[PDB]
Design a protein around this ligand. Structure first.
Ligand SMILES: COc1c(/C=C/C(=O)c2ccc(O)cc2)ccc(O)c1O
Ligand SMILES: COc1c(/C=C/C(=O)c2ccc(O)cc2)ccc(O)c1O
Ligand SMILES: [Zn+2]
Ligand SMILES: [Zn+2]
Lengths: 176, 176
C-alpha cells in the first residue's frame, strides 16, 4: 500500500552543507525538429531562449529555454553562459542533427511501455483560460481540464509528443 | 548542420502577456523504490521533501523534492500543497505501488532506444569536490568529471538509473 508519511520522512536526511548552494538547473529532452520546438515553447508557452550551444564534431545542438525576462540575458557571450547555466528550472532541448529529415525517427515520451520520465509541468494562474488559448493555437491535448477524473488539471503535448501538465497550484487541494 | 543562432532566434516569438506568470514547476520521474529514491535525493543531493500525496484508488504516491529550506514549508495541509506546487524547479517522483517488490520490473532512463528524456541537471559550485563526495558515498557514475572530452562535466545515476548531470555554471565558459 505505499509508504506512510512517517516512513517516507524517515528515509529523508537533512541537507549536507556540501550541497548548500546546489540548484535544480535543467531538464533535458531530445527534440526531432528545433524549429517546431522553439516555436511552441516560445510562442505557445511563453518561454525565452536564453542560450544555444553547437557541437560541430558530435553533430548536435543544445537550446536552453526558461521563464526569464530577455532583458536580463547578459549581453556578453561568456557571462551569458554562466548566467544561463545558473538559472533554476531551464528546459534543455537537444537536437541531434538530421533527425528532422528522418521519416523513420521519433522520440518516445516515456508514458507508454517502456515507461520512465512522465512529464514537465507549468504552474499557471488559470488552467481553463490557458487551455482555451492552447485550443485556439491548435495545440494537441492528452487531457483537457474537464476530461477524466481530475477536473481542473490539463496535459498538453509538445511537437515531439512530450507531455506537459498545466496546473494551478491554488486550485490543487480544493479537489479530490 | 542544425540551425544558426540567427535562424534559431527567428523561430522564437515574444511571450504573450497571458503567459507572463507561468513557471516551470516540475519534472516527473517514475521511481521503482521510493525509499531508495528519497535517501538519494535528500542525503546525496541535499534536496528537501516538500510534499507527499497518496492516491489509494490509483495505487500510487507522489513525492515532490526541491532545493527549499524545510523551515519554509507550511504547517497547514492546504497551504502546504499550494506552496509546494507553486515552487519552481521541483522533482516529482511517482511510486506505482508494488514495483519495489517486483524483481522483473525496472523503469527506462530515456538514454537508449526508445530515446527521449535524457537527464536532469544540478548546478554545483565545484564539480570536482562534489564528485569526490559522491564517490565517498558510492554513487554510481555515468561519466566522471575527467573521463571523455567534456572535462569538468559529470553524470551520475539515481537508484532507478536516471542520469543526472553535475555542472559548474562558472567554469563552463570553455565548452560549446
Ligand atoms: C498524475 O498525477 C498528478 C496529480 C494528481 C492529483 C490529483 O488528481 C489531485 C486531486 C485533488 C487535489 O486537491 C490535488 C490533486 C497532481 C499533480 C501532479 O503534478 C501529478 O503529476
Ligand atoms: C545535454 O546536456 C549538456 C551537454 C551534453 C552532454 C551529453 O549529452 C553527454 C552524454 C553522455 C556522456 O557520457 C557525455 C556527454 C553538454 C553541456 C551541457 O551544459 C549540458 O547541459
Ligand atoms: Zn544537460
Ligand atoms: Zn505532475
Amino acid at each position: 500500500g505505499g509508504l506512510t508519511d512517517e516512513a517516507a520522512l524517515s528515509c529523508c536526511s537533512d541537507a549536507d552543507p556540501s550541497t548548500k548552494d546546489f540548484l535544480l538547473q535543467q531538464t533535458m529532452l531530445r527534440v526531432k525538429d528545433p524549429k517546431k520546438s522553439l516555436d511552441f515553447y516560445t510562442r505557445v508557452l511563453g518561454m525565452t531562449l536564453i542560450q544555444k550551444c553547437d557541437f560541430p564534431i558530435m553533430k548536435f545542438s543544445l537550446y536552453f529555454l526558461a521563464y526569464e525576462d530577455k532583458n536580463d540575458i547578459p549581453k556578453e557571450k561568456d557571462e551569458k553562459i554562466a548566467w544561463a547555466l545558473s538559472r533554476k528550472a531551464t528546459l534543455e532541448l537537444t537536437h541531434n542533427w538530421g533527425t528532422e529529415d528522418d521519416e523513420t525517427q521519433s522520440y518516445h515520451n516515456g508514458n507508454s511501455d517502456p515507461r520512465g520520465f512522465g512529464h514537465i509541468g507549468i504552474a499557471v494562474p488559470d488552467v481553463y483560460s490557458a487551455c482555451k488559448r492552447f485550443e485556439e493555437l491548435g495545440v494537441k491535448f492528452v487531457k483537457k481540464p474537464d476530461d477524466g477524473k481530475m477536473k481542473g488539471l490539463a496535459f498538453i503535448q509538445d511537437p515531439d509528443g512530450y507531455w506537459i501538465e498545466i496546473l494551478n497550484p491554488n486550485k490543487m487541494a480544493t479537489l479530490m
